[PDB]
Amino acid sequence: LEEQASR
Amino acid sequence: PNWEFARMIKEFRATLECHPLTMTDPIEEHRICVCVRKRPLNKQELAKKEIDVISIPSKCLLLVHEPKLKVDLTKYLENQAFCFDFAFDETASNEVVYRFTARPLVQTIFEGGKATCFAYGQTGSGKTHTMGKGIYAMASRDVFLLKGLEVYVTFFEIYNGKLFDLLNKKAKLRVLEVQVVGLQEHLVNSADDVIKMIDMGSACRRSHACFQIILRAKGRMHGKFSLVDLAGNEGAEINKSLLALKECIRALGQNKAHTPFRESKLTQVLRDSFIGENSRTCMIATISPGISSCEYTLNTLRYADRVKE
Amino acid sequence: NWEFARMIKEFRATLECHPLTMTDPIEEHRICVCVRKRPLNKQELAKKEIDVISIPSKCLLLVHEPKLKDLTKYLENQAFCFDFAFDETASNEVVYRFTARPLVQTIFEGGKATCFAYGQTGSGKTHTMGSKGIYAMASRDVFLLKNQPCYRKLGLEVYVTFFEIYNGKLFDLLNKKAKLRVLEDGQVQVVGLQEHLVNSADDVIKMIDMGSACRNSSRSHACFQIILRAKGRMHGKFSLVDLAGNEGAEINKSLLALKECIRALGQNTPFRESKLTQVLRDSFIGENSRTCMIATISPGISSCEYTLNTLRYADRVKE
Ligand SMILES: Nc1ncnc2c1ncn2[C@@H]1O[C@H](COP(=O)(O)OP(=O)(O)O)[C@@H](O)[C@H]1O
Ligand SMILES: Nc1ncnc2c1ncn2[C@@H]1O[C@H](COP(=O)(O)OP(=O)(O)O)[C@@H](O)[C@H]1O
Ligand SMILES: [Mg+2]
Ligand SMILES: [Mg+2]
Ligand SMILES: [Mg+2]
Ligand SMILES: [Mg+2]
């Protein structure tokens, strides 16, 4: 999409 | 706006997913801990349109994108990667920072061994702020939460080989063969007393600064916690002291009996600290992500890696 | 080596990189660039050739390139970001799900698809593409669509065509290794090509194997075209290319032009230069054309001189 900061 | 670099940094980070460090993570416990902490770009730094230049794709990995130039003068990037026990960024509080660096060490001094923590880097990076509330105080109540023994507090600075105790208003001291007499050790009954010792020591009107937690039972030392805020790694005699540190720390993964001194005033008084079958240490290399302070930033890291040794 | 082995080893000791799982969302990309690290070979290993490709994130690769100054030791851990980065644990289907699978969806709307592997000899290309093959899995997935009760209108006649281009001298691997002719009107179009219609995915595999059996394999590209036809009318064409070894002088200008022609696909093409750019010119025009590049590499220290160019090529194909 992109891209995503998460974990 | 240099502009073209900020273009190249963002067409990098676009394609990049990052899995940061969280409180969900386990608290690791090593011989020598090497961490790094990037501070956020301040207003005055932002107001000049300074590109952030450092990323943290994970809990440990750290990526720096440095602006290089050809002989063409073709603007370039060279993406250098670095690993550490815990790399953490803007979002990281001190509560985060204490938990992964100093927090395991409080238990260490109550054992009978002795622990020391350094924040090291460039001027205006985040050394004083990290340790100064700060890591000193954060250990204190957790030092005081753990319960017959009494606790003593030391605070002093090292400049030009001289040694000041801020506790007494500018009270010069001497170091000898290891023992520093005139050692100001105030007894505290809880964080209350200690918190008052830090700010008073800090209030005093290019220098190392050391804070100590000490334990005695019969009146005999049990555990020593030494938290140092080093000078800027950029008269140039400071270069030597920090250089010695690397060697002093290194002899602690060799479980070594022998260490070098004299050529460094800082070490001498911190010197019990680099020996024993129970001596742990953490190192905090803080950096300024402001692109036009990148050379200082790299130097701050090339010092800290492989000093896992 | 020894030394450069412990600096790396020390680095990958605190590394906590995560591995991309199949569950990971398939992205839909107009121009996808991925990198495939190849597992270490027992021969490369036997010589204790050292592993030097750190792939910590689904979207990220590293190369601890070994150079030295006083000769006091250092390591330059270099980062390259990508849409995808495959490790030595990534299966073929694993690489399929994120490169060629979404592209199958594109040909069924008359769209044009073209997908490359680009790396040195002994990097993974001609493996990693072609039952093992991205070729084979393309068909298998293609036939599945034709069966679905959603495209069964457009009564299509699956075809096949596997040819090889070598120094301007192209060759159709569908005959007795016969040669071909290429022209274009005042558009592009081949001559003599024999579109092989298949109707079993097994058909394609035994259709490919000819070119396999026929075809150093490294001075020439292998180009495989899947074409959908409804009633003899062309729908969409999918080109899968096992490129010539990227490491003989015309070859570099075949990749000069290719790289140039993937540049303008993003900007919505200097095709007339090289023969590879001529045959697949269609798949580089319009808003209907998607491409996927698999720059594949070698994990060994000796390669690092030459697999840092393949990485440098790829980084200039995302813009
Ligand atoms: N979390 C934070 N991120 C960024 N800047 C901060 C943060 N906390 C405090 N600061 C401010 O940054 C300033 C830098 O001072 P200091 O930390 O002494 O620089 P250095 O320690 O590098 O010499 C401090 O006055 C402090 O108020
Ligand atoms: N991901 C992989 N897993 C296992 N083996 C591989 C992988 N990639 C390549 N190989 C092996 O490496 C060898 C060389 O690869 P190949 O693609 O045939 O040559 P080229 O790189 O010139 O196309 C092949 O025999 C193949 O078996
Ligand atoms: Mg900015
Ligand atoms: Mg300061
Ligand atoms: Mg790894
Ligand atoms: Mg090959």
Numbering used by the authors:
A (entry chain P): 710 to 716
B (entry chain A): 228 to 359, 371 to 385, 394 to 423, 429 to 456, 469 to 497, 513 to 587
C (entry chain B): 229 to 297, 299 to 359, 370 to 425, 428 to 456, 466 to 497, 513 to 533, 537 to 587
From the paper:
MCAK is the most potent microtubule depolymerase in the Kinesin-13 family. The C terminus of MCAK binds to the motor domain. The C terminus of MCAK induces motor domain dimerization. The CT domain reduces the affinity of MCAK to microtubules.
